[PDB]
């Protein structure tokens, strides 16, 4: 299979270099429209009882267009907001902004308009705000409408106004993606180019992995844009495409180009060198890519629309990177030939480190597993959470505006729990039924009494403009003090016994996050099984042995545990926050699953890169110890360079202004730092020496089944 592609990618090395570049360049110019069609919805289990409640509330009671924009106005530096002139002109400026953007601005209500809104002006009368509703029946439509007016909105009062609310914060959160890509393009791509020049020594040899990575990120963006035609694609799709199309899409090029240069040095002519580098390195790259696919395919079981799009992005990027690395790059090398330049590796440093590692293997593995289990201890205080304005750096000037709004006008932002009363007959709900449901619900403590009286608790929702006043659905709502009691009292609410025919759905933003967390935790028992079973079999196919898949699975699990522990200790416990410019916050549950999948997949890739050389050397008659020596001395520099490349790519994203991407990239950095600077150098050789000659053992039926498939060719005569 791989020994046939090596022979057919050289006979037609132009029809593969001119067609697979067309499909990635003209297919990448199609992805330039991806930024418009990416959505921000998908963090919630769309089949839960809280999403149902939110949809019914929006349908019947109309969307809550009150927190979209709040614009804080300040007195004329030694005056009050009740100034006859200043108030008049701020009015006369909010008018002619409502009417000069009629397609985006629904209206505006504030103290400057109605004097009966004393809750919209501070007690000293020096700060006031107005609420600007935005037209749009979809969240992304509302965000686009806000983006169409934001540059002209800030000019009110003369630049003095401060914008806050749902839409400015959403714009700030989604506006960090462009900044991240700009930082990547101007800081990591040239730095990765310099790293590639240092590892290879030529501009042509170093250029080829960059070309493959660029083609991968163009084609993956094109594929994602194609996927956005049918379903929703999240905003996080493109940063992950960048990560996985410039870290591993460049690792694959590194390995294949290095293998080609190794085969050229042996004296093999151009065609034979291409065939052999395919047979070995392209096979290893293909197995690494399918291992990533297997690791990240389990995310398809989770109901979050965020994860279902991020897994598509990951799968598309890795498959395109592998296809490029086995189609275009071998053709690029076959055309170039010996012009890419334009027993000592095993006797140097890498061959002498794993000669002390295997001489006292317990001393180099027991301390490391001990110090790598102690890194798991911090994960106990995980405390997942949700997205808010605090996912921005404390100096964002938008988070600052929102925090100043919260300080000045407390009580306006409510985070209520909503009970959706709904007759099964589709009949007008009797006001006595709402009374009985409220009476049952007015027996659970921990809910915000507005004026310390029961008569205003569990108030009915307000009818908005886009409200279809269905008489068979009524919704009540209260916020709760101590948001930590959300999980404890959501179950207390969901245990009410409706009187005769009512069916109460409990929703609200606090419930929307707990439902997503529980929906994600209800499929870990099967997602983990899939992630383990699909990688064990694939690594048995890659390494014609049974013990090695188990060993690599154990090391990958240990690396994942240590990475999660470090992430918790840094981002949840709040260490190095002042250095990295973030606020210690609860993590997001879907991103934890994404981190698990990516870390497991990439650690397994690095294990495959390390052990494929050992398996290849063993088939050449080498003993078990020599197999390890050659295997991890021939690939030491290449794996170090690949780890540095991905570390640079992720560290370009660690400096992001979004905490989500910060700890995603930092988890990747920690995982690869461990897997390339502790695991590879000490744990794998020591364990493989302790196991003995049984590292290479697969039953006879297993190897003949591997041959029947056609994937067993790990030996080059
Ligand atoms: C790379 C970028 C990708 C996107 C990045 C994320 C962008 C998305 C924005 C995220 C977001 C706006 C955040 C801004 C808040 C500012 C409020 C200012 C108000 C000023 C007056 C809304 O996010 C949207 O929420 C919608 C429904 O909730 C949902 O709509 C759809 O949902 C369904 C289908 O998804 C379906 O039912 C249906 O189709 C739709 O209904 C959208 O899908 C979803 O995007 C989160 O809201 C915030 O979350 C916080 C929970 O932590 C919450 O509590 C915080 O504050 C409390 C203090 O009180 C404090 O106690 C808490 O401790 C604190 O945690 C906040 O109160 C809340 O505001």
Numbering used by the authors: 1 to 342, 378 to 752
What does the paper say about this structure?
MmpL3 is an essential protein belonging to the resistance-nodulation-division (RND) superfamily of transporters (DeJesus et al., 2017; Domenech et al., 2005). Specifically, MmpL3 exports intracellularly synthesized trehalose monomycolate (TMM) into the periplasm (Grzegorzewicz et al., 2012). TMM transport is essential for the formation of the unique Mycobacterium cell envelope that functions as the main physical barrier to drug entry and neutralization by the immune system (Dulberger et al., 2020; Jackson, 2014). The driving force for TMM export is thought to come from the proton-motive force (PMF) established across the inner membrane (Grzegorzewicz et al., 2012; Székely and Cole, 2016), although the precise mechanism by which the PMF drives lipid export remains unclear.
To obtain the structure of Mtb MmpL3 we generated a C-terminally truncated (residues 1–753) construct capable of being overexpressed in E. coli. However, cryo-EM imaging of the protein purified in lauryl maltose neopentyl glycol (LMNG) permitted its three-dimensional reconstruction to a resolution of 3.0 Å. Our map reveals MmpL31-753 to be monomeric, consistent with the Msmg homolog (Su et al., 2019; Zhang et al., 2019). Mtb MmpL31-753 adopts a transmembrane domain (TMD) fold archetypal of RND proteins, consisting of 12 transmembrane helices (TMs) arranged as two sequence-contiguous bundles (TMs 1–6 and 7–12). Characteristic of RND transporters, sizable periplasmic loops connect TMs 1–2 in the N-terminal half of MmpL31-753 (PN, residues 37–166) and TMs 7–8 (PC, residues 415–544) in the C-terminal half of the molecule. Similar to structures of the Msmg MmpL3 homolog (Su et al., 2019; Zhang et al., 2019), the Mtb protein has an extensive cavity enclosed by the PD. Within this cavity a lipid-like species was captured in our structure, most likely the detergent LMNG, which adopts a splayed arrangement bound between the PN and PC subdomains. LMNG creates a substantial interface, packing against 35 residues (within 4.5 Å) and sitting within the suggested transport path for TMM (Klenotic et al., 2020). Structural comparison with the Mtb MmpL31-753-LMNG complex identifies striking similarities in the binding poses of all four ligands.
